[PDB]
Structure formats: C-alpha cells, structure tokens
Amino acid sequence: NQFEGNDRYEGYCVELAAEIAKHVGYSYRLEIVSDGKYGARDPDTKAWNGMVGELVYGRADVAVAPLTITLVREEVIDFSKPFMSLGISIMIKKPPGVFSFLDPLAYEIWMCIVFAYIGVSVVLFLVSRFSPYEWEFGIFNSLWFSLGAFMQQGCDISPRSLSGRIVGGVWWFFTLIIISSYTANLAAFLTVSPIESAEDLAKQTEIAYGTLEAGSTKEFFRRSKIAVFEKMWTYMKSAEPSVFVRTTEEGMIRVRKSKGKYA
C-alpha cells in the first residue's frame, strides 16, 4: 500500500525485468494480465488468451513472466533463450493411539468376550456347586479359572466332573480361536509407497490429479502422443468433477486440503 505502480511488486521476474530494462535501455510499466491465465489458443474461438493474447494483440510489448517456451506459442510470439530450466513434476501432500491394541478385534467382539467370560464362569459355578454328588469351584474360584484359561496361563484347579469338563473343553477351544485370530489379524494389520506408481498407470486411484487450466502443462498433456500421457489426458479431460484448477495457489490448497487424495 505504501508503494504504487511497477514498484508495488517483488519477485524473481520483477528484478529480471528491471535488469533487462537496464541493459536494453527502455522504460516499462508492469501490467498484470487481466485473465490471470498464462496463455492458450481456445480451440473453438481460436483466440489467444492471457499473456500470449496480450502480446499478440498488441496490448503488451514484452512478457517477463514464467512463460514456458512451447511450439504453438513460438509460432505466434518470439522467445529469447530460456532463462530458467524446469519440467512437469508431481506434487503430493507430504503427510497411533493409546488404545490402538484393541484394533484387531472390533468393539463388538470385546463386548461379547466379557459377556461370555461372565456367562461361562457362572455356568461353571452352577454345574459344579448344585450337584449333591460333589457338594472348590465357587463363584470366585470359577471366575479365576475361566479368566486364567483365557490368556493361556493355567490354574491351580482343573474341573473333575463331566459337567465341569465340558464347560472347560469348549472355552479352551474358544480361547484358542480368539487368541489365534487376534495375532493373525494383528500380523495382517502390521504388514499392510509414492513414485509415478500412481502416475505409473498413473493415479490409478482416488488420488485424482489435475493441472492448471490454460497452462503449458495442460497443452502438453492435450497434444501428447506418449501412451502414459495420452492415458492421463483421456482421464483428465473426461474426469468429473474437473481435476483442473484456475491458479497454482488453488491447486496447492487443493492438494493441501485433499489430505493426500489429490496429486
């Protein structure tokens, strides 16, 4: 706000324009392009828009922006030797829990385990205490045995009656499946990666990837004849919603706010 005119801006191209003006010996006014687009020939209207349009129609005499040298543009405007090298590149968002150890078995399984632990211990107490043939398996001892036999730790008492041994037999089988499944599921969880992988076949995945509209990159993809690039273009042109963006900042925020779902 303290400054106005060409002095209101800063950046690499500002100093480059200053130095070029010094060497060539001319005065200049930095006009920002109105469209905010780099430049492209709209295939329908055949009109050049953005900086290239500003240059061709005579509204501007020079362009000192990061304007890519392309064949289509070289046919309508003159370019100097490149002042910076570059290439098309992929940008991806660079991005445990205290009670995460309950993850392998869902919240539903744990509730039924404690219900089964209460259910079997009471049944073991009933089938071993109401019998006048027998009467050590009170309510407390039965809870200790079933809880002990859950984590494979044994106990100082083993059922002796047929009724008690059947109850112990199924729980001994029951705890084998649950413990084995938890370890097996944890191993799968701990077992299950950038690269032109999602850009090998390309995205392949919800990792929608877009470009800037009316830029050299969009034009590069449109006119490409390389299998991968043709596949990418056929995807990008038809994909909905539009993967393309209107400004670089817009694409940057789209990747930052897509949380690694936008490349």
């Binding site: 539903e108 399984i109 049944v123 109401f130 008690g164 109850v167 037999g169 029951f174 599921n185």
Partner: protein, 57 residues
C-alpha cells in the same frame, strides 16, 4: 440432425432419457465359536440335570 445438434436438442434428450432416470475383525466371521460355546453350556447344563436326577435315583 445438424440443426438439432447445434440447438442442444440432442444433448437435452440424452440427459433427460439417461441421467434423469438413474480391517478390524467383525463378530460376523467369528460368530461360529460363540454359537458353539453357548451350545456347550446348554448341553453341559442339561448333562448336570440328567446326572443329578440319575444320581438321586
């Protein structure tokens, strides 16, 4: 056909007739052991009553 295409009629007809029509382990795959378990207690509880009546008489 050229007039219908240039006037957007074909696009509207298409849109009208096609578009407007339009790893935690679960209890589900471990329900077997719970089913076998409750069957174990139900059989074990019956065995106690059968043996208790046999032992009494």
């Amino acid at each position: 056909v050229l007039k219908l295409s240039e006037q957007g009629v074909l696009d509207k007809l298409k849109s009208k007739w096609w578009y407007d029509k339009g790893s935690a382990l679960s209890l589900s795959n471990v329900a077997g052991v719970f089913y076998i378990l409750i069957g174990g207690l139900g059989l074990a509880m019956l065995v106690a009553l059968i043996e208790f009546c046999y032992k009494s008489r």
